[PDB]
Amino acid sequence: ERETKIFEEAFTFSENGFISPENLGCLEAVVSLIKLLKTNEWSTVIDKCIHICLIKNGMDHMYHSFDVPKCFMGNPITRDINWVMFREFINSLPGTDIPPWNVMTENFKKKCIALINSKFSEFTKLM
């Protein structure tokens, strides 16, 4: 209860709440991203914590119905990952300042941007 209330207010990313369809849309890309890349310790901590939070609020089926959204594919069957738009999504992610999730969120964002470099706002209003 205590640490989940802290983590829900740490990943609001919107105005309505942690249960709104816009926040559930923007969390979907982060859960897809975490598993969509190399299994990091910070990435799997963020994944398990979002999973615990969606179990608590009664949205576990909506967690297990996650995939990449339609605003990151080029074709439905041809699984293509629009990395430039995804980098714009991660770069425009309003990560909060409250400890201890600000440091972890910032390091998560840095290693995701760094790993997509090593391979080579409007988003939440859309989804």
UniProtKB/Swiss-Prot annotation:
Residues annotated for Zn(2+) binding in this entry: H51, D60, H64
Localization terms from the record: Host Golgi apparatus; Host endoplasmic reticulum; Host endoplasmic reticulum-Golgi intermediate compartment; Virion
Quaternary organization: Homomultimer. Interacts with the glycoprotein N; this interaction allows efficient polymerase packaging into virus particles. Interacts with nucleoprotein N.
Record family assignment: Belongs to the Bunyavirales RNA polymerase family.
Record remark: domains: The N-terminus contains the endonuclease activity (endoN). The central region contains the RdRp activity. The C-terminus contains the cap-binding region.
More about this protein: Classified as His(+) endonuclease since it has a histidine upstream of the active site that coordinates the first cation.
Function in brief: RNA-dependent RNA polymerase, which is responsible for the replication and transcription of the viral RNA genome using antigenomic RNA as an intermediate. During transcription, synthesizes subgenomic RNAs and assures their capping by a cap-snatching mechanism, which involves the endonuclease activity cleaving the host capped pre-mRNAs. These short capped RNAs are then used as primers for viral transcription. The 3'-end of subgenomic mRNAs molecules are not polyadenylated. During replication, the polymerase binds the 5' and 3' vRNA extremities at distinct sites.
Protein name, entry field: RNA-directed RNA polymerase L
Species of provenance: Bunyavirus La Crosse
Organism taxonomic ancestry: Viruses, Riboviria, Orthornavirae, Negarnaviricota, Polyploviricotina
Gene name for this UniProt entry: L
Residues of the full protein shown: 2119 to 2251 of 2263
